[PDB]
Design a protein around this ligand. Structure first.
Ligand code: 8OG
Ligand code: MG
Length: 129
């Protein structure tokens, strides 16, 4: 079967703003407004998957932990698990290896349009704030 897991955590900055990968720092993918922690799927545990990938997607030392929301849905012949974790702080700039560098933005205005549309089920909840 076709199934893939994803665990992410919105890093909280020093100004109630979270650092998320958006249009990279100088890339073309402007609709890549996503978060770190992806790839947890690999072969980790529901708990170590994020905690492990966290170091891989942050590399820094941030007071980051707890989950904000987690959901598991499967598309017509596809299985996508998206876990959203809550973060409270992060020292310096987050690097790890998420993919496309981001900037400290206000999560109160998340972009469900810029980020993957099929991945709205998660944002549809928080987006409505
Ligand atoms: N089944 C399913 N998987 C999806 C959808 N959208 C989406 O990004 N995914 C997948 C692809 C990605 O690899 C992953 C999210 O993190 P990455 O883009 O970093 O891999 O989940 C979808 O609509 N259905
Ligand atoms: Mg990763």
């Amino acid at each position: 079967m076709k199934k893939l897991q994803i665990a992410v955590g919105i890093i909280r900055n020093e100004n109630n703003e979270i650092f998320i990968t958006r249009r990279a720092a100088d890339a073309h993918m402007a609709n890549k407004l996503e978060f770190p922690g992806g790839k947890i799927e690999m072969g980790e545990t529901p708990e170590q998957a994020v905690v492990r990938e966290l170091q891989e997607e942050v590399g820094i030392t941030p007071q980051h932990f707890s989950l904000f929301e987690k959901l598991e849905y499967e598309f017509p012949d596809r299985h996508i698990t998206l876990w959203f974790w809550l973060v409270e702080r992060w020292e310096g700039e987050p690097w790890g290896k998420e993919g496309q560098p981001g900037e400290w933005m206000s999560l109160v205005g998340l972009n469900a349009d810029d980020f993957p549309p099929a991945n709205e089920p998660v944002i549809a909840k928080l987006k409505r704030l």
